[PDB]
Amino acid sequence: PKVQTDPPSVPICDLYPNGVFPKGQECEYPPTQDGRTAAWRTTSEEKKALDQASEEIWNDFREAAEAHRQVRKYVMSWIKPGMTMIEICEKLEDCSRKLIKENGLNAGLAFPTGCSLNNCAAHYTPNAGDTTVLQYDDICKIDFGTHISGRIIDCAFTVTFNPKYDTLLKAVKDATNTGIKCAGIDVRLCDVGEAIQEVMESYEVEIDGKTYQVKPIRNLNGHSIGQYRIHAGKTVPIVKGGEATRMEEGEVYAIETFGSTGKGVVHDDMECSHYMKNFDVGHVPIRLPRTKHLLNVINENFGTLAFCRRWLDRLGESKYLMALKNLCDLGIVDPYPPLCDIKGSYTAQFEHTILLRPTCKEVVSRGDDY
Amino acid sequence: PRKIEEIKDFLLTARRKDAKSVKIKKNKDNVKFKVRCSRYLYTLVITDKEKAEKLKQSLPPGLAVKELK
């Protein structure tokens, strides 16, 4: 077992050749059983026994989360205003590739690195020729994910340079942490939405002499993660009045939380860059040779994971966004264009992937940074 | 199309400025030399093999040659 170099280059598995990877923050489930605590499963009964039955699955999440932690520390180390996010995304992606030692689909990037600026919320990454220099008075949402054998971990944070945004950052961080602690086994999603809205709205923001009230973006919400499936079909809300579905043992969730000094809703603003093949659709005929070729290329290289046009240009494929929209109309791939708020507004996001262990709740994405 | 009947004419019409290419077709019993001109596709047919190669050495340079066989 060796150690990591100052510019992170050693693969995570090389740092832990034993096979066991650092555990996330273990937390007992909330005492939502009418006062009765859940500190009765931590004892090594059959609960722990069947927890051990899925130990190998967890280790993949652990290594992915560790890789995410090192990558985000590296990004925090050198990120600064004045440099465009094309090279920022290139650096983040290449560092993550080296740290995860990607090989086909057994390991690699779960989805393109999102870097949303100002009113933009999510699902934005620069395309080819995108000349956007960063500014001192900017806020950015760095959302990126890594996976091991399809065990996806999703985490996101917000970077700021002007110290006028710390109130909004702390509000969104508190909302995300409250959603984290509120989540548990056999709890309704409407409850977590209740908690998130009741913690996050009780904050006030003073920006540029104007006092705003921070509100959730009712359009976005958290999601459940599946095997090579970023969205398993369950969405945890961040506003009041949602579904009454429960969370069950053995599932993983991404507890996202967005806060804006705007209208609390988002729409499609600029050119789409994120794309995702549908996990549920089967075989749909195609009539264009270029479209067929692009489809088989993407299903070989990106499978069901999300991809961006940069990842296709990185593969040497050109003249392809045509067949790409063709797959979009055919329903094979669903575009995910950037979501943006009103101009002049600001948005902050913090995200963590949580594990519902039989004995406890592990937030594998937890780090010392946040 | 037009049939070139005697050898001397064919290398003349192959030297015209409008001659774009000559295509050589190899059949069981003969070889056909077809030159694509502006208005006609002239064809010269020889029934014996040995003259086919010697004529093949004597096409004007720079004129595109296509071998069907």
């Binding site: 729409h267 499609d268 603003d269 600029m270 789409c272 | -």
Partner: protein
């Protein structure tokens, strides 16, 4: 960035056609964005760019 009538009145004839030409060129590109997948921000630009055509063409006329 906003084309206004009164500042164009003292401007000379030659570059007014030059100003007209590119505005037509961007208008053509916006129409290309419409038939393909088009951003809403992009789809807002036809009306404003069309009115600048009228604004400029009114000046020369």
């Amino acid at each position: 960035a906003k084309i206004k009538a009164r500042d164009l009145r003292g401007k000379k004839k030659e570059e007014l056609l030059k100003q007209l030409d590119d505005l037509k060129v961007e208008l053509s590109q916006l129409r290309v964005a419409k038939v393909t997948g088009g951003a809403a921000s992009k789809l807002s630009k036809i009306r404003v760019v069309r009115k600048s055509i009228a604004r400029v063409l009114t000046v020369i006329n």
